[PDB]
From a paper:
[name] (K+-dependent P-type [name]) is a K+ pump that is responsible for high-affinity electrogenic K+ uptake into prokaryotes at very low extracellular K+ concentrations. The heterotetrameric complex combines a P-type [name] ([name]) with a channel-like subunit ([name]) from the superfamily of K+ transporters (SKT). The channel-like subunit [name] consists of four nonidentical, covalently linked membrane-pore-membrane (MPM) motifs, referred to as domains 1–4 (D1–D4), which are arranged in a pseudo-four-fold symmetrical pore. [name] is a 7-TM P-type [name].
To this end, we determined cryo-EM structures of the complex loaded with K+ and Rb+, both arrested in an E1·ATP state. To incorporate Rb+, we employed variant KdpFAG232DBS162AC, in which a central glycine (KdpAG232) of the [name] SF is mutated to allow passage of Rb+9. K+ ions co-purified in the intersubunit tunnel of the variant were exchanged for Rb+ by applying turnover conditions. Here, the KdpBS162A mutation prevented the inhibitory phosphorylation in the A domain, enabling turnover. In both samples, the complex was trapped by the addition of the nonhydrolysable ATP analog AMPPCP prior to cryo-EM sample preparation. The structures were determined at a global resolution of 3.1 and 3.2 Å in the K+- and Rb+-loaded samples, respectively, with higher local resolution in the transmembrane region. Both structures are nearly identical and adopt an E1·ATP conformation. When comparing the individual nonprotein densities in both structures low-pass filtered to the same resolution, the densities in the [name] SF S3 site and the [name] CBS are increased ca. two-fold in intensity in the presence of Rb+, close to the expected factor of 2.524–26. This suggests that the densities at both the beginning and the end of the intersubunit tunnel indeed correspond to ions, not waters, and, consequently, that the tunnel constitutes the ion translocation pathway. The nonprotein density in the S1 site is absent in the Rb+-loaded structure, probably because the mutation KdpAG232D changes the SF geometry.
Author numbering:
A (entry chain C): 1 to 190
B (entry chain D): 1 to 27
C (entry chain A): 1 to 557
D (entry chain B): 1 to 682
The structure:
Amino acid sequence: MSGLRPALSTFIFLLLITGGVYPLLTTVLGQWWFPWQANGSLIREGDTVRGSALIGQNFTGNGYFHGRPSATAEMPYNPQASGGSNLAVSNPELDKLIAARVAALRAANPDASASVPVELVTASASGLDNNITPQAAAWQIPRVAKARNLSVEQLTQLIAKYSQQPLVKYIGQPVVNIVELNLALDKLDE
Amino acid sequence: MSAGVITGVLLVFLLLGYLVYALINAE
Amino acid sequence: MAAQGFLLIATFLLVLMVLARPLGSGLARLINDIPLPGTTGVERVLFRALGVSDREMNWKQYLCAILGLNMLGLAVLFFMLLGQHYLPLNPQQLPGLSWDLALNTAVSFVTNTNWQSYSGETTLSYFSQMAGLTVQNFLSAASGIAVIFALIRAFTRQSMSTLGNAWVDLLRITLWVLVPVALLIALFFIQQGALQNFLPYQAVNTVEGAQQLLPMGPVASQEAIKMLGTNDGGFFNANSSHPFENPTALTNFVQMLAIFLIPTALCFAFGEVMGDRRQGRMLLWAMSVIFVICVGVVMWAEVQGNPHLLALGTDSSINMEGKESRFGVLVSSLFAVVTTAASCGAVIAMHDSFTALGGMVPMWLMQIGEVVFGGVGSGLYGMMLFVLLAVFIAGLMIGRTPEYLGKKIDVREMKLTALAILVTPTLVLMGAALAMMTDAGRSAMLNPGPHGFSEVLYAVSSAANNNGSAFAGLSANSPFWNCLLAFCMFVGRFGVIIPVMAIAGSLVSKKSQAASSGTLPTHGPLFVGLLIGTVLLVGALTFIPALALGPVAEYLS
Amino acid sequence: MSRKQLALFEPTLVVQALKEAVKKLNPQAQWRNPVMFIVWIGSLLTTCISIAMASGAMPGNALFSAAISGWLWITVLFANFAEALAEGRSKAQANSLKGVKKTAFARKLREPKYGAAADKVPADQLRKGDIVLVEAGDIIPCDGEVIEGGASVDESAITGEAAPVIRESGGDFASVTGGTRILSDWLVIECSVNPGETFLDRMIAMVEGAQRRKTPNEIALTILLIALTIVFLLATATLWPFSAWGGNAVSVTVLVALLVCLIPTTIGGLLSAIGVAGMSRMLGANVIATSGRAVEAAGDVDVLLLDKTGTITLGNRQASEFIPAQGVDEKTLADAAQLASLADETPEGRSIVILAKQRFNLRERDVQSLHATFVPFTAQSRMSGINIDNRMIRKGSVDAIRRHVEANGGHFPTDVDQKVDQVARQGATPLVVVEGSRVLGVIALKDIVKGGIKERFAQLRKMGIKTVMITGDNRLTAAAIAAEAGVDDFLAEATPEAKLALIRQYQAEGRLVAMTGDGTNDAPALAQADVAVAMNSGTQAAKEAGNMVDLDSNPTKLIEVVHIGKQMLMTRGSLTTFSIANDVAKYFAIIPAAFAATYPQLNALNIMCLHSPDSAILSAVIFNALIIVFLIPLALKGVSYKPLTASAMLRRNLWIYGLGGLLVPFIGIKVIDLLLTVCGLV
Ligand SMILES: CCCCCCCCCCCCCCCCCC(=O)OC[C@H](COP(=O)([O-])OCC(O)COP(=O)([O-])OC[C@@H](COC(=O)CCCCCCCCCCCCCCCCC)OC(=O)CCCCCCCCCCCCCCCCC)OC(=O)CCCCCCCCCCCCCCCCC
Ligand SMILES: CCCCCCCCCCCCCCCCCC(=O)OC[C@H](COP(=O)([O-])OCC(O)COP(=O)([O-])OC[C@@H](COC(=O)CCCCCCCCCCCCCCCCC)OC(=O)CCCCCCCCCCCCCCCCC)OC(=O)CCCCCCCCCCCCCCCCC
Ligand SMILES: Nc1ncnc2c1ncn2[C@@H]1O[C@H](COP(=O)(O)OP(=O)(O)CP(=O)(O)O)[C@@H](O)[C@H]1O
Ligand SMILES: [Rb+]
Ligand SMILES: [Rb+]
Ligand SMILES: [Rb+]
Ligand SMILES: [Rb+]
Ligand SMILES: [Rb+]
Ligand SMILES: [Rb+]
Ligand SMILES: [Rb+]
Ligand SMILES: [Rb+]
């Protein structure tokens, strides 16, 4: 003893409090109060999970709103990697990727403006970005409208319906839930 | 690594040891 | 954009000061060894049951208590990470970590750096992520606050030899500041959308037809304490900016507030304990001027962004690369400066994809020793060495004996202050030189040219200065990188904790001279500018040769 | 010393006579200066590198490495030159005051008389316990107290005072020192110094300390300079692997040049010069201070403690007037005073008889030795007198005689009180005399203040030092003396244990107090005080107790002591601030120059538009060498100190020296590079 019993007692009690009670109380209160948000904000049709309202998925069809590029390890928009492209400003590989993305987006959206938004050509910080700006979502109205036989007014109303704005404009940006918007597009088709 | 880098690193460690000894002592 | 950035800085600082002043009074009550209201009796039962008799301890005994707690935590965490295949809460049956990786992350989470060279969702189980790497998130923060409690007690106590009970301090901090505030923060994060469960990984049949595996786990409970205790970490590879960790802009703002909460409340507590609020307002002004200047510089650099984006056909030149669309470049720049000045390490954005100036200023903010609302406890006792340098220089140029808060600052204080200051630049320069001289350190680069050296220098600076943030283009999972950064983190914390404790134990024995007519006031704009100039000049002249070959060369290229 | 004044810092003789020693400060005995030892090792390394290039090595440009090595050697020579110049100025003062040991004659009297045995001995053979006899005109062969007789003494050869100093047997004017000349009459003194511990030896130990002790502020500044040397050495030595990854690595000679240009060579070379020049200026203000630690600790004095009889007043104190009481005749008053002052050796007691017998023209002609029974003066008793007969005669202060007469049975009259506070309002110190519980009367003791010191006390008020007057006189006489002298406050009727209690009271408050005294009475109080400015006119006990002794006997010499002490600290801090501030322009001159082939894009940082990388680095090294020479006069003279507020003076020092260390190296490097380009060597 003599400085060993208080050391072990304090460390063991703090271990118990901050690895037992505190995460258990946090989990119990989370599942009791906000279970959908605490379980991942999963989206289901039937009994099959169609995705999360926060993570985002790889979209490549013409009738689907495309999100920001992803730089996860195995596949684009891979939740098992959840990294970003750590490419420098001076890196020529980043410029090559940006040029390829700009050429692909201009090929895919001919009726849109030639100035592609930076959101759709820059890889996000985590790869799993479910959000784009409403300007970037309204830049790709003609492609989705031509692929879906919808109206520009209907598409803009759907984007404004699925647009989330922060409490004040300077702590963030207005965003569009891409997965929820595409699921609403599918439901409007059905 | 050649002899020059070894000599440089040895000189830097000797200077650092002398300076740390001087900082510890009241010469 | 400039108006929005100014409004963001002003709102963040205003809400921070408003939230931090009552916590300043609360922490001052723990410095003065006065129990919090409502905690009396519970303390009497609990300390007696544990075996803590509230005996007061010297600096040697206090430091031995802190080091013994940290070594016990290191051993427990390291063996838990090695044996994570034999422990419950493993819904993926992930194997045990290797020796080098386990040692590196154990030293990371014990020495409050929380560096991570792995991918969390494919490396760590729920038990090793919750009962480890969160217990240490509490414990390293509590140890830092205990050391700064000892330093403030040394400044406020006259002619005694003891520094209070380290076990009482750690228990009070963890039970009454770290736990009940992080519980509310975790509950708010769960409300906003952060994960908190123990489910297996949820397979997703996507809209198009592909299959992705969503990882689950107790995310928000760890996120709250890594933001409260200025820790890095993250359930996932992205520290922050993962939607399951930082879902909303309100969550991000609360994260920044929690990062600067305790380091600002510590300055408020110091000012209240000394009896002069100007002594805390001086430190707050000296931190805030540097912080605002750095935030403005990084915001302007990120707004200018990539010059090739406009040439290659994009809409703007704004550096949106490696940043989340749920935030902006302004919010990303503010968060980057907050975490690299606060020794936090959480990243809202890939700092590797930042511009040259916006990667230099966070790197330099780490390199100055994390004094600008720095690490929890460690920021205050790191700037309390530059304050000793400033009062020594100012006392020389006024002709008086150097003196801070009445107590004289003699040869032993200067020796230990120099030894404490020397630890982090020495480790940064030796680690960067050893990584540059070794192919095992040099081959971890991702970006060529000067920016690979920027990656190496950023990694070594974050390890030595207990930040934990990374460019993340560096493949730091090598055994050489793991051992090098483990040594850097270990020495960079425990070679500063020891001489600060020695300074405290040599300053308790002194007496406080009363204020005279010729005594220099350690507050006001003159001393704030003097301390600011000392900090910026030392942190510049130490690292201009290192910074001129990386981000400066990249900017001028 | 004031007279025989020191010449200019550069009289063009000691410059050569000390640069000859500077050429002998070059070898490896610089281990005690780490900042200069780093420059020495770097210079030797660059010399070996240039020799290797001259004899055949991998790189080229042997001329550039040779010039860098030569200018680093020149930097070492300059930084040793400042130290040796200060040390040789101190040795010049030491040789000026070293020729005082002249005489080889000393009489050996067996008993203290007018003359007992004229046995001549060499003065070096004098030890403690011996007595000598000096005539009118001879010089003093030893340092000690005076046993019998008084004589006017000319202390010009030691202090510089052309005015003679009176030395009289007994009292606080008994200590005499060697080298001085008797001007009046015979004098018998005692030998109180052994060979090797005289006042001249104390002077030589002050000015010519071979192992000169470093003050704690100097040691702490040395620690900070070592720490700056360590961080700059690491940041410079780690530049080679970084440039190696960048491409072609930087050359070792350019790295050594940057290392010397970064570390604080200026303050690191001028620190010892600052200390030795501070000792030289300290002795030049006629103070013999044992410790530079004491000199620097005197800089934060906020309260100064002064004696009144021996310090503020000259200490002659003639008994100017006669004052009798009711039922008392002047014959009885003068007789009582003369009998009480027969065997008294105090200056007041001698003055009593030597004016009273001539004033009344009547004298009780017997000496005190016939039926002798005499009691001396003890300060705590504060009373003296004679009791040769069954009757008793005593004289002393009002409180002493009042306690004596209440002990006997009588009482002190109100008429006597009226005369006492009347003469106290006049200013003379009253000594009340008594015979058989009868208060005969008082004696007016007129005293003279040491010139116009009210301006110096106003200066002490402006500098922030509150001065009080410690004495043992009455509460009203001390009030009048304080009003004449212009001091802030006073403490009267103070026994020396109460003075020591006041020292402990002001010292336990946290204030670092200073005391000025001359007598053996104030010797333990001076030894207790933090700063003790003793007086040369006082006693050897007070001189030994005090950590610094005056020679001009000025009450306000603490002004000059604080001047040189704060000049030391301010010069150290100012040159430190200049040295760290200088590195910004060194970076702006060397970094775009050193990284000019590995990274050609770094030329945008060349804001000075220097001609070439070699010219830039060589000009930076030239300025690093020349700033030491350009700051030798500042190190040898001290910075200009004005009695400002602490905050305002810090602001002034930051402005001047920080802005100088910022902008001056830019101008200096640009001018040196322009001169080099014009001359054509680069
Ligand atoms: C070059 C760059 C320069 C950078 C500048 C950086 C400046 C940062 C300053 C650092 C702050 C630390 C020091 C102050 C802390 C303590 C505050 C204090 O004591 O007050 C008195 C203090 C000194 O007064 P004193 O006479 O010595 O003592 C009086 C006592 O303290 C009297 O005590 P009291 O009882 O009256 O007060 C207690 C309580 C009394 O009231 C209460 O009881 C509680 C009231 C609040 C309760 C909640 C109500 C709701 C309020 C909203 C809060 C929401 C939180 C709740 C959460 C929900 C959120 C929805 O009120 C408080 O709790 C604190 C008062 C508010 C603090 C203000 C925060 C300071 C920073 C904010 C501005 C920074 C902007 C600069 C950045 C932008 C530049 C780009 O005055 C100050 O506050 C100084 C700061 C003033 C603002 C900064 C001025 C500069 C701003 C412009 C910068 C220009 C830069 C130019 C850049 C280029 C632009 C073009
Ligand atoms: C090497 C570089 C060399 C540098 C060269 C320059 C150095 C000399 C500069 C001389 C300038 C010429 C004189 C200008 C005077 C006018 C300017 C002025 O107002 O400031 C006065 C100031 C003197 O003030 P003071 O006499 O001590 O204060 C007592 C008052 O007079 C009366 O007493 P009071 O108690 O009544 O005062 C009340 C109030 C007085 O102030 C007031 O607030 C006005 C009264 C309003 C009502 C009171 C309510 C207060 C609540 C509102 C407060 C917000 C106001 C601030 C707004 C934002 C401003 C940013 O004070 C306070 O409230 C305390 C709170 C603190 C105020 C906030 C401090 C502002 C941030 C300072 C930023 C400086 C950045 C410089 C960076 C340089 C880095 C190189 O003089 C200065 O100009 C200082 C500024 C320059 C700093 C010097 C930089 C030194 C760097 C050297 C580093 C050394 C390197 C070491 C190397 C070796 C290491 C080993
Ligand atoms: N010959 C004498 N016999 C008796 N009393 C005397 C005396 N000479 C002086 N005194 C008195 O004794 C007291 C001693 O005062 P004094 O001037 O010596 O104290 P002080 O502190 O001012 C000088 P110091 O500390 O050198 O003795 C005074 O009251 C003085 O009047
Ligand atoms: Rb951290
Ligand atoms: Rb530093
Ligand atoms: Rb930290
Ligand atoms: Rb630090
Ligand atoms: Rb830190
Ligand atoms: Rb430093
Ligand atoms: Rb330093
Ligand atoms: Rb220098």
